Amino acid sequence: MIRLIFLDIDKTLIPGYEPDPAKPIIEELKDMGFEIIFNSSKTRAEQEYYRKELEVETPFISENGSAIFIPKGYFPEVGNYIVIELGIRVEKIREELKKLENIYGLKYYGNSTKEEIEKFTGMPPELVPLAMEREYSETIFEWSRDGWEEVLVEGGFKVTMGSRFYTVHGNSDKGKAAKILLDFYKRLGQIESYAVGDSYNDFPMFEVVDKVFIVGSLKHKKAQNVSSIIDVLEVIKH
Predict the structure, then answer these.
(1) Is the distance from CB of 196 to CB of 5 less than 8 angstroms?
(2) Contact of 213 with 6, CB cutoff 8 Å
């Protein structure tokens, strides 16, 4: 019986931005026999850093389900597939944001300085370069007028609210990506899947997994609300 758990890589796991706070949680999940899958709005560069520091070598999903990364030979016809691209290239997103930049006073990674990005996010200066290595999405830090969200959706893009900012991406979401990865595991036998989210970008995963937890007060019909990731492990222990 394989147990899988999808986790975000934000304040609910790494408050303060350093990896260390997540260690107690990762270690317990490992002891509980879980395959830990980060399914985050974060870039591959950001996730690879945390994974290495936390010694997590399982597949991961980046930029709101835009790509699934499977370590070479992780799963025992040879496809030789390491990266499954499901979203749209960031260059296309930026071409569209350029058309809206002035009308709506939009600020995102592509048109902001490292100093501005640090101000907007509060992220440590040394991590900004990792967040800037975007491949399939943009994060909107601010705007001077509303209405750009609808325009983007009309243009065929997805605009999803995260724990703090909107992320612009396309053709996929955390749920579509999670479902595909789950299929890879299901080929190995029976699986039990859990998902822990804290924002609207996690909602798509809920209909794809067996058990759902929400850290915070966001409400969803399939989710059990808890105040901390600590509580998730506690409730699962029941």
Answers:
(1) yes
(2) no
Q: Which amino acid is at 238?
A: H
- What tokens were used for 119? 């101000």
Helix 23-31 with 229-237: angle, nearest 10 deg: 20
Delimiting residues of CATH 3.30.980.20 domain(s) in the chain: 88-170
What was the resolution (in A) of this experimentally determined structure? 1.7
Annotation says 8 is catalytic? yes
The answer to whether the annotation marks 173 as part of a ligand binding site is: no
Cα 204 from Cα 179, distance rounded (Å): 10
Residue with tokens 């520091």: 53
Instruction: Establish whether 163 is an annotated binding residue.
Output: yes
- Name the method of structure determination: X-ray
146 is in an annotated binding site: no
Strand partners, 189: none
Any idea which fold 2-87+171-238 has? Rossmann fold (3.40.50)
Find out whether 148 and 108 touch, Cβ atoms under 8 Å.
no
Q: Which two tokens stand for residue 197?
A: 């989210």
Closest among 137, 126, 150, 117 to 41, alpha carbons compared: 137
The CATH architecture assigned to 88-170 reads: 2-Layer Sandwich (3.30)
8-state DSSP, 227: S
Q: Residue 135: what residue type?
A: E
Q: Per the annotation, does 10 bind a ligand?
A: yes
DSSP 8-state secondary structure symbol assigned to residue 16: T
Closest by CA to 136, choosing from 96, 201, 92, is 92
Of the candidates 8, 31, 173, 231, the residue annotated as catalytic is 8
Phi-psi category of 56—alpha, beta or left, where left has phi over 0 and alpha has psi -120 to 50?
Answer: beta
